[model samples]
Structure formats: C-alpha cells, structure tokens
Target chain A: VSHPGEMIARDLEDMGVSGRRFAHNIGVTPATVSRLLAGKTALTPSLSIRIAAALGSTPEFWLRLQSNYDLRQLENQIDTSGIVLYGESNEQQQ
Target chain B: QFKVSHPGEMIARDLEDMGVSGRRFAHNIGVTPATVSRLLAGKTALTPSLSIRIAAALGSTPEFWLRLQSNYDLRQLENQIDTSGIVLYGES
Candidate 1:
C-alpha cells in the first residue's frame, strides 16, 4: 500500500502543483509522470536522485521506501520453511 | 572511506558468543554446514532470507542484517558503475 507514486501525487496536490508542470520542471515527460503517479513504473535510483533534487528531499528517502516495499513483497512471496525460525530461549531469561 | 567487513564476520562473532558450533548453528539455521562454512569464509553474500534466519537466531532485527549487506554491497556498486557517462542535469 506504500506506493511512491501515490505519495508523490498527494504531495503535488497539497502543494497546489500540477502534474504537467511538475514533470516539465523535473525534466521528464508527462507520460513518465503519469506512469509514476499510477504506480505502473518503479522509482529507480537515478529517478530517485532526480526527484529528490526537484522536490527538496533526500534520494535515500524515496529509495528506502521503494526498497522496503519491494522487500515486503519479496518476503511475502518467499517460502519461509527453508529458513530456521529461532524460538525463544529460556537461557536469556536468567 | 570506511572499511566495512563482510556480515560473515559479525555472524561468526555472534556464533562464538552463543557458544554454538558451526554445525549446530547450521542445523538451527536450517542450512548445511558447508553453507555455513561458505558464509563464514565470505564467499557469498547474505541474502534476505538468510538475514532473517540469522537475525532470529541472534536476537537482532532482520533489517539489521539486511542493512549490513546493503551498505557493503552499495559500496561495491559505487565502485562498479562507470561515473564518466552518468551525471545529473545540473552537474554538467
């Protein structure tokens, strides 16, 4: 549910900005912005750097959100049985 | 330029602190002893699932181990990507 596109759209709306203008300002096409706002495309590191420069945010902020989202998706789809889930140790209680 | 050791070093230290042999640790982590040996030797990167298993065993968050790998790999990545051709619009 943590879509960077959705986050960006909200930020644009809050700032009274239009997508077309924002795209032009950021040196990307409106179609690219549309795809981003629709969450159809991933926010890549290079794009994150560009967006950070234009939006007054850190590239890591955007990249970390995308990374965490991707990790959660991967974790959900992965088979966990192969991994050992350690149980609580009574020794730690002493 | 900070020198970051492989996550294997930290894992080995944790295993020592727990007084667990490599084979037993491998058993608890649901991996082969050879797999543990390779990890200790820093021959392979600690993947996400492996990080989760290690974190669960070591009483640390999975993100802790993941970030260690991430930070280490990111440094390597920075070294690998050619910088001469890539530049931001303003950097030119």
Candidate 2:
C-alpha cells in the first residue's frame, strides 16, 4: 500500500529489468526480491545501500521512501556520519 | 552508501506494475523467466545486481533493496516453522 515502494517497482520494470536480475544486482536471491515486490516485506538498511547504488543514488534516498511506511518519519534527514552502527556516534569518537 | 536488510515484496510489486509479464521481465534482466515468475508470485528472492538494476531503473535507493532482502530471509525462514504471530512479534 506504500506509494513510494510501488513507484520504485514501476521504475525498475520501465528500465527493462526482471525481478530476478534486480535481485542479483542487490546481492540477494530471486525469491527474496519476489517477496519484497509482492508487498510481503519492507525495505531495510544493507539492502537499501544496494538499492541506492543500483538506482544511481544514495541510501538516504531509499530510506526516505521507506519513511513513508515506517513510523520514523524524517529520521532519514539526520546525518548518519555522527552515528555509529555498533560502537559510538562520530561525536563520541571525536 | 546505505543498506537494505530485506526487500522481496517491493521488487515483486515493482515488476508487476511495470506491465511486463514475469517471463519478459526475467528475460530483460538476464535471469530465467521462471525466476521472474517466482519473484512475482512471491516464492523467490532478490540479489545485489538485481537490486541495483531495479533502483537505477526506478530512481530508487540501494539500501531499500538490501534491507528488504534481509527481512525477506528471516520471514521466509519463519514461514517454514510453526512460529505463531512470529511476523508481528519477531520484527525488530
């Protein structure tokens, strides 16, 4: 039901790509891609990077798309450079 | 660079909306039409290359694809087991 996710799918097909090849580009299996496109799942982080790369954009771009469905609205706007995945945000490091 | 942990349904939806059949979508992407069919039918998965292609084509982000893939793996694995309400509680 997410508008962005649906738009993303339409764009992929217009480019003449199969869901299978799209999966390959993202480093996942065809089955995984199928499920995502089917609206059975939502977009995550790592996969977001791959999706961004393929789209010739940034992961932030994809995250914004997910923000539509997720509760963390506008969170993507925050700069991640200061945030840390497992250790500490760049502020702590500094 | 961003990431997409899971992304099955999103890809399927995109392919379907393209108005091209699964078989044709698969053919254009260099994967088997069967693969495309499975993807559309929600029986298969997505790869890195395919994710990128989709993103690039749709002007989306790579992270979306990657995250969707990761999430799909967990969900599908759960599907095989009898984990009741797993999707609702296990998501994190």
Candidate 3:
C-alpha cells in the first residue's frame, strides 16, 4: 500500500539524500521534488522515468505503483456489482 | 492511430458496431444509462473494476481495456509535465 511518494521518501532517506540535492541531481526544481513528496504531483510515465534516473529504480516501479494506487483509489467509487462473469449469464437461458 | 484513444471511445465503437444501444447496454451490464453514457462519452475514468465489468459484459481482457485508458492518460501526462532537464537513465 506504499504510494509512490512514500517509496521515494524512503529511497531518499536510505541514501541520506536531501530534497535540493536530489532535485538538482535529477535536473528538476526542488519544488518539483517537494511537490512529489507532498503528493501534490502524481506519477506519470515520463515523470517516473525521470525519477528512475535519479533514484535507484525502474520507471515501471513507479508506474506499477501508480497503477495499484489508481485502482485502489477508484475501487470504492465505482459500482461493479452488476457485471456477471462472461459466461455466467449465458448458462441461465440454456 | 494518431493519439492514444480513450477507452470510452473504444466502448463507443463497440456499442456502435455491435448494434447495441447505450440504454440497452447499460441494463445489460447492470449500470445506469447515464453511467454508460458517461463512459461512452469519455467523461469517466475507466477503472479496473469498470474494465472487468466491461470485459465480462463486452469482450477482451481487462488489461486491454485498462491499457487503452492508461496509454491515453500517460500520453496526456507526458505533454503536461516539463521534462526539460531531467537526466537520462545513464549519464556522466
């Protein structure tokens, strides 16, 4: 359940890295890293790629994290009760 | 083939080519007509749960439906973000 921000925070902590240091190394403004850490910015493919370059992870890592995070975020809001399994409804008539 | 398409657009095509009406398909999938319309209009984000429902009610894997939207969203994000000076994976 760790969000992208949480993982980034942990990685930064593990490396004893600072926000300005990491942001400058990544070629972004400190505000960018700050926004990311504060959850103001969400993960995207290109952003993830940039993060991966600065951090010791793959873009897929953040993207996969984003995927789970997104699905979990929307799970409760949607109504999926009506979707019967593909073949389940067909047998009822036969 | 140009821009990545919204899954809703795909859903719209499916409904049109399958000869299914929005209201009729809504009830078939057990959602409200408005919900179906929202999806058809690309006004809603297609979630995994919705994609599962769509996969079961329509056809194809949930991944197919999900990637459709993800690709579009990712492409949009790519344009929105400023990557002007980001380092490449390997550098000096």
Candidate 4:
C-alpha cells in the first residue's frame, strides 16, 4: 500500500497543484508541505483539519490514513499475549 | 450519582483481580512502576505506544485499549467544553 505522502503527491500531480502554491493556499509553510509530502512529519489533528479543508476532504480521511499507517508500524514491533480479559482465556477460567 | 472511572482505573482493577501487582506488571510490560502508577492515577494519557505495550501485557488488542482511552478522552473533552456562551452563526 502507498504511504499517504505518495497518495498526496499523486493527487497534487493529477490536480496540477504545485507544493508551494498548495502550502500557501492552506496557510502552512512550504517546508511543512514539503515535509508532509516527503513523509517526514506525522499528520497531526490540526494539520489534518487544515489539509482536509484545503483538499476538499473530511478530517476523518486524513486521520484514518495516519491511523492505518501508525498501526501497521506499531504492530511490527509489539507482541500481544498473556493476560486475558474475561471469558477469553481458558487458563483464567479453569 | 456514580462517577465514571477512567480506563486506567478499570485496567488497574482488572489486573488486581488477576493477582497482578503494579510493580510486577510494570516490569513485565517493560515500563517503570512509576509509569504504571501515573497511568492508574489518571495523571497521563494512555498514548498509542503505551497502549500497545499495555495490551500485549494484558492479553488485549491495542485497539481495545486505544478505544477505551479515546472514549474516556472524548468524554472528558465534552465535559470541559463550555458551550453555553458560544453562538452559532447563520443557517440555524
């Protein structure tokens, strides 16, 4: 799956929008937009809201993208096991 | 009226019921006992990274812990928002 930055870069190319121009339109610095396009920064809630407004998408769209990306990254390093909540564990029950 | 408990409190109670001490649980979960104490005391927000660690330690999914934390946070935010003086402009 493509990263959000790749998706955004493609969208910008298809829409014929330059990064600098789009950043100005969204009231963020060009460096901010550049970093976002390069996937160097996380899409925070405020940034998601601003991006949603400027790109004609809902904030949920951006948040969902970031959430998926973060979850995948987290899953790679985390191990889920041991204690059980309620009826899920046979050892705890018996 | 009954007061709503935070997810940390709920989790702490659950751990206690399972005979898990905060210090031992913290050691197993690769976090400090102080970190566990802060969480149980509701002094810190259950961040995503911490959620993953806690879930792994407690046989739960990160989503489970994250959702509980999110709902608690949203409710707290709702309670904190004083909308009485705010006005909605036009098209109401």
* Rank order (by DockQ, best first): 3, 1, 4, 2
Docking class of 4: incorrect
lDDT of 1 by residue, B1-22 (tens): 7667779888888778767788
* C-alpha RMSD values across all candidates: 6.5, 21.0, 4.4, 6.6
| Cα misplacement distance, residue A59 of candidate 4 (Å) | 2.1
| I-RMSD for candidate 2 | 18.4
Error of 3 at B89 (Å): 8.0
Per-residue lDDT for B1-92 in model 3, tens only? 54777788887886788788989887877778999888888788776677767876877766667777767766666455555566443332
Kindly report the interface RMSD of candidate 3, rounded to 1 decimal.
4.7
TM-score of chain B of each: 0.81, 0.56, 0.81, 0.77
TM-score of 1: 0.56
lDDT of 3 by residue, A41-77 (tens): 7776666767866664666566777777766776566
lDDT of 1 by residue, A1-94 (tens): 5778888888888777777877777767899989988888877656665676666556556766665765676656545444444455344323
Candidate 2 lDDT by residue in tens digits, B1-92: 23323355565576567665666655545567777666655676665555544454444464566456655554444323332221211112
Q: Which stretches of candidate 3 lie over 4 Å from their true place?
A: A19-53, A56-61, A70-89, A92-94, B88-92
lDDT (Cα, 0-100) at A85 in candidate 4: 38
Model 4 chain A poorest ten-residue lDDT run: A80-89
* Cα TM-score per model: 0.56, 0.38, 0.65, 0.63
Compared with the true structure, model 4 gives a TM-score of: 0.63
